[PDB]
C-alpha cells in the first residue's frame, strides 16, 4: 500500500528534498503537518517531495 508513482519530474530544492522523475516508482513513509510534503524513498535515496506529485500504483 506504500507503492507510488511520480506524476511529474521534481528537481530537489535542497532542505532534504528528493529529486524524482515522472513515471518512476517510490515508497512513501509519511507526510508533514499540512500534508503538502511527502517523505519518500526511491533507488536514489530518501527525502521530501510534493504530495500531489505522486500517486498510488498497484
Amino acid at each position: 500500500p506504500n507503492l507510488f508513482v511520480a506524476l511529474y519530474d521534481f528537481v530537489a530544492s535542497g532542505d532534504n528534498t528528493l529529486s524524482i522523475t515522472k513515471g518512476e516508482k517510490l515508497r512513501v513513509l509519511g507526510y508533514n503537518q499540512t500534508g503538502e510534503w511527502c517523505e519518500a524513498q526511491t533507488k536514489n535515496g530518501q527525502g521530501w517531495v510534493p504530495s500531489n506529485y505522486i500517486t498510488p500504483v498497484n
Binding site: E36, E39, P50
Partner: peptide
C-alpha cells in the same frame, strides 16, 4: 519537511 510550500503541479 521544508518550512516553505512545495511548487504547485504544472
Amino acid at each position: 519537511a521544508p518550512t516553505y510550500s512545495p511548487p504547485l503541479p504544472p
